[PDB]
């Protein structure tokens, strides 16, 4: 039995936009390996699955936080009691989604990675989910989220800057997320700007020496760095 039926189902889940189910499908593939690693196709699907499941909660959290602020500032105390209870239900889901993909990165995807690209990808992804904890967690939990994000992004960068070109979308993607961590979570606009510019310039420097479909892949991310650089200046 090769259940790459589980891969096909995840692809249908994706088409259907039923992302919780896309997660289950790609989780079944993941928890089914012995010594083998997720292919590129498979890890991307897993990551897209989780980005969409977490993304709906993050989008909901943002709108409920705005409404909370707007209402606290009109003294509507009764609204605020309600909005806050709603915000904490979203925070449980955020908290559980992050735990699921963190357990699977700590337990499985990270210890068993082989190539560089893989290691960076998964260490990057661990940083990503500690970052999402830090967007809404409060005290000790926020400090622990922020520390875990810095360690994972840094472990990913040491491996990236050795074992991958400056144009490799995974190296750019790390720089883009790490730049954002510095701006949104640590509140270092300088560190963020410098990190994005450095990885952009370093990628232009060695750009027109890759197959026409590579250019597509990483022009995409490089436009994301430039978009943020514009927004911040």
């Amino acid at each position: 039995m090769a259940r790459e039926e589980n891969v096909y189902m995840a692809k249908l889940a994706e088409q259907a936009e039923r992302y919780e189910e896309m997660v289950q499908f790609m989780e079944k593939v993941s928890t089914s390996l012995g010594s083998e690693e997720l292919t590129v196709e498979e890890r991307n699907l897993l990551s897209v699955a989780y980005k969409n499941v977490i993304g709906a909660r993050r989008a909901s959290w943002r709108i409920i936080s705005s409404i909370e602020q707007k209402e606290e500032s009109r003294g509507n105390e009764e609204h605020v009691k309600c909005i806050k209870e709603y915000r904490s239900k979203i925070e449980s889901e955020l908290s559980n989604i992050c735990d699921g993909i963190l357990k699977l990165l700590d337990s499985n995807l990270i210890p068993s990675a082989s190539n560089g690209d893989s290691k960076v990808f998964y260490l990057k992804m661990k940083g990503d989910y500690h970052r999402y904890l830090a967007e809404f967690k409060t005290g000790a939990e926020r400090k622990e989220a922020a520390e875990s994000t810095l360690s994972a992004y840094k472990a990913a960068q040491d491996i990236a800057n050795t074992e991958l070109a400056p144009t490799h979308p995974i190296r750019l993607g790390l720089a883009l997320n790490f730049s954002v961590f510095y701006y949104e979570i640590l509140n270092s606009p300088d560190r963020a700007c410098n990190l994005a510019k450095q990885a952009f310039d370093e990628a232009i420097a060695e750009l027109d020496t890759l197959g026409e479909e590579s250019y597509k892949d990483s022009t995409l991310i490089m436009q994301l760095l430039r978009d943020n650089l514009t927004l911040w200046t």
Partner: peptide, 7 residues
């Protein structure tokens, strides 16, 4: 809006 990676 600020952006992050697609993966």
């Amino acid at each position: 809006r600020t952006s992050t990676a697609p993966f």
